[PDB]
Symmetry: C5
Subunit: 205 residues, 5 copies
Amino acid sequence: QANLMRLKSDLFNRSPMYPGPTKDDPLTVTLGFTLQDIVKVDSSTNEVDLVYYEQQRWKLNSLMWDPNEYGNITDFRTSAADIWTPDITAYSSTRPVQVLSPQIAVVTHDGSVMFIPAQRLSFMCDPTGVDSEEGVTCAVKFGSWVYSGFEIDLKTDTDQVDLSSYYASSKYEILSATQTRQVQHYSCCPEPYIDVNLVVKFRER
Amino acid sequence: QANLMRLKSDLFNRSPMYPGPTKDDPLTVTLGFTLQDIVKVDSSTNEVDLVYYEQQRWKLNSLMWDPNEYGNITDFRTSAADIWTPDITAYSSTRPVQVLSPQIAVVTHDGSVMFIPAQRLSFMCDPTGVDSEEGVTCAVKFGSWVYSGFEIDLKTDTDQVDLSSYYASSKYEILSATQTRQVQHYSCCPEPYIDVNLVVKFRER
Amino acid sequence: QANLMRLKSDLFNRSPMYPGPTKDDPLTVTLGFTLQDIVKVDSSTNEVDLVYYEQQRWKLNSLMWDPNEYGNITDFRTSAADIWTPDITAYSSTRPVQVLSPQIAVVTHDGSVMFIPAQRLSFMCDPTGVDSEEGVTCAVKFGSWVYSGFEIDLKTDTDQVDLSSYYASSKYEILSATQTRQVQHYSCCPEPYIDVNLVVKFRER
Amino acid sequence: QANLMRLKSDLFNRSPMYPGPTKDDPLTVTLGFTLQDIVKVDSSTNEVDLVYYEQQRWKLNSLMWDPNEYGNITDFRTSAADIWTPDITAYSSTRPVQVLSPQIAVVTHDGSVMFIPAQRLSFMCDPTGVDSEEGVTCAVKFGSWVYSGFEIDLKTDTDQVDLSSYYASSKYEILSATQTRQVQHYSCCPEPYIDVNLVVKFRER
Amino acid sequence: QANLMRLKSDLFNRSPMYPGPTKDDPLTVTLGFTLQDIVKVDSSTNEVDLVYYEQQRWKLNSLMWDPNEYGNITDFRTSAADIWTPDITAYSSTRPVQVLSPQIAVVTHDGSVMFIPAQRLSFMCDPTGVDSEEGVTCAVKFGSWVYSGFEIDLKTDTDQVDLSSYYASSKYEILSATQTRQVQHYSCCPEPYIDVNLVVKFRER
Ligand SMILES: C[N@+]1(C[C@H](O)c2ccccc2)[C@@H]2CC[C@H]1C[C@@H](OC(=O)c1ccccc1)C2
Ligand SMILES: C[N@+]1(C[C@H](O)c2ccccc2)[C@@H]2CC[C@H]1C[C@@H](OC(=O)c1ccccc1)C2
Ligand SMILES: C[N@+]1(C[C@H](O)c2ccccc2)[C@@H]2CC[C@H]1C[C@@H](OC(=O)c1ccccc1)C2
Ligand SMILES: C[N@+]1(C[C@H](O)c2ccccc2)[C@@H]2CC[C@H]1C[C@@H](OC(=O)c1ccccc1)C2
Ligand SMILES: C[N@+]1(C[C@H](O)c2ccccc2)[C@@H]2CC[C@H]1C[C@@H](OC(=O)c1ccccc1)C2
Ligand SMILES: [Cl-]
Ligand SMILES: [Cl-]
Ligand SMILES: [Cl-]
Ligand SMILES: [Cl-]
Ligand SMILES: [Cl-]
Ligand SMILES: [Cl-]
């Protein structure tokens, strides 16, 4: 359709790209995790591998449009390259995250963007006692690597991690999986930094 | 040489790229698998490695042309970068898919496109009992990561996976291989998401 | 160096790139293998690792020039990116080929191009009996992934693989190595596809 | 905000990029290490893997501005690609460094730049005696690969490595971690080269 | 700085890039190796891993300048991408070379260029007898992949490999390390190909 072709150029090729949030014009990114599998556990390096998808959501006034002015188009899909995306990083990874999904995001007329990156992550986790009935607990923090609390804010729609798509025949059972917002102060910086703490209690099936 | 150079310019450099399907202008992608080998089976992580090529076909009105107006050219080969391609993704992969073939597609005057990506896939599968006479059964779903059934529809020309090119001296005998269209409903969204379920039954040779 | 700078500009920057062969403009690519080493044999996955270089050769009328019109220059070296190159692919690889040589080709005034890519290949090969006196035999087909026989034809200057540069202290002895042209018919396509079959009989040193 | 979009334009797109330091216009880069984990130790190759983040800091006159002239903007985040960055390299690495953080730096109105790359490093370290109560000591030098002392100078805000974020359940305890500036002389060059020596004494739990 | 920025524009953005050497305008590249460590020895595949840096040196008339006309600037550092670099390749590698240093070269007013790439190399080497007092000897040839002797010539400033920076606590002692120039003849070509043979005799510590 000719209508959608016009909207994409009337937004991206017509205006310069979003320079990211500022202290004056902050941004709130809504985070959410859907855990798929605990693939590997390396007891000799205390490295644990997770397969999950991360639901990222934010709103930009620069991405708004009137659907009536563009042939009643409410939303559209686009390459994550064509738009600004938050630098949400795992604070205890041991190897670069592996992307398992297409780099496509969906933009809506109200300016809200949704990005659902699937990934394989290796993080610092001591699995001592995973073989027990009680199980072992491990956590990993996610947040911006460069933006403070005054620039990028985080939130979760639920504190419960989505386990509805967890791999039934995994070598590891999930006992609990939690996503909790945290406000931390680091020596580096006078301003606070926000993260979402992914905490999973698991055991050998 | 000169006629083909002109056609490619008029199709890609003159008109804007296809913005993908919409609910109003959907698309049907025909899927098909040609299984080559079951390379590896990791019983400690329940990860199984597949080598296959998936034939994907779709038709675009934006890609039509009159062969008489372009020196009786009926079709041509082009980089998969020069054209829109469907985001068909494996829903239970454990590592990024490895591409084993050139990223070239073949376009025909009727607007039909054919892309046959060869790849190595590691997916979640419990291989317990592969050592038996009966063998073990495993499945993996393929479908769009961002487009719903209202935007991208999937179909198969047959429900029989092409095993004509399966590696005769593989460590694993293929007992059966099936490709079935399935329509799923996810908690995530209020529209159905459709996929192609690849179901293999195999055993040790 | 001024003469060569003019020639390279007048060929590539003056004319649009070669859109690849067609049935009206066919092409014959001469193939040849120089086997260097059989590095690894994985009996649990039936994957064998080769190190070789393949000599690719073709001729383009679009790449012809008068040496007298360009300061008696008969030939020149150029990046494989600056020119069209055939999509010669291994039909039974298990992992993406690893390039071990620079991506440079040599162009001659008659329009003939020579490209000698060195590479490490992992392909489907059952090594059962490599430990015997008789040894084990394995094969791998090479050919275009998208072009038929009426677009790209293949030929060999000899059926005998160059073993003159094979690694003397390899863990595996080559008993024989053959390169044979094959014309194959696939259901997919009304035209015959053509390839070069690399067959190597080898054993433990 | 357009105020920032105009500043990024007037800095980078208006002026040519910084050609790096010279003997006439030198630069001092402030270095600092935050050690996160000692992931593994390979006693058969004497290779040790570290996870840490490097804090890089320098000031450019070409990057300073009056905040009042650009809507009271004191600082901003930007891709490490659109700015010059020092070539600080590990002098005893055994494999290419793996980047674990986004390639974003923060520029301030005074022309001071801060870059905090997180990374996984494999370096030459003999772990003989890591099993003892005394532990083992290892070091790695960091510095410019091309710029000398007269071009790039290095300094540390402290000689103590930040261990505040070290992984509590690591297989290895840190006994001490030091960052010391060194001025060395190499045969290659008549001018002194300067580096920061990362020295860590550790032991297995 | 205003002065260096102008020279970098007048050198690269003014004139077209160097099309490489020809038979009429040859080039002599001076090679030199600084061996850092023998990391690994794989007796089951006869693959040995080296960590070293390779000093490359050549002179181009196209890169000459009058320092007085450019604010008494004698030399400058630049990306290896901005300039032509020789295709010096290891003739017996088993995996792609891993770069361990920044891709920056230093250009001098006389047109002489220096490039010092650090790298990790896996090459064909039978380590049988490394455990003995006598040790084992291994070699690897380095040279152009496309240019003959009549186009690129190689030379060494010394036949002795720099062992001054060899890793003190390496699992392997160097008994001798030699960098000798060789002129050979291959079947492929009527012109002689020239190379530098890196020969290292080593044993277990
Ligand atoms: C969350 N951070 C990492 C944090 O220190 C950390 C590191 C490892 C484990 C747990 C937390 C904090 C802040 C961002 C990110 C990287 C570090 O970043 C910084 O040091 C910083 C960031 C911006 C400007 C100046 C300095 C520290
Ligand atoms: C099928 N999906 C993956 C799902 O997690 C899954 C995993 C394993 C087996 C079967 C389905 C479901 C739906 C499409 C695809 C990607 C995910 O996509 C989404 O959740 C989504 C996509 C677009 C807009 C808003 C949300 C979840
Ligand atoms: C030679 N081909 C691959 C070969 O048959 C093969 C078979 C099994 C596994 C791996 C390679 C054949 C033909 C080209 C190439 C890729 C495949 O291509 C096709 O099926 C095809 C090609 C062009 C248009 C429409 C369909 C099969
Ligand atoms: C520290 N360097 C390496 C050094 O030789 C070394 C190597 C291994 C271990 C420890 C130090 C020194 C100086 C920078 C870096 C690379 C080498 O660089 C050079 O030899 C050089 C640099 C610029 C112009 C001409 C030559 C030597
Ligand atoms: C040294 N070469 C490889 C050589 O055959 C070899 C291969 C393995 C081990 C030792 C030497 C020789 C020459 C360069 C390089 C690549 C090969 O290159 C060629 O065959 C060639 C080069 C230019 C024009 C036409 C053909 C052969
Ligand atoms: Cl693994
Ligand atoms: Cl590992
Ligand atoms: Cl493997
Ligand atoms: Cl290996
Ligand atoms: Cl390793
Ligand atoms: Cl040998």
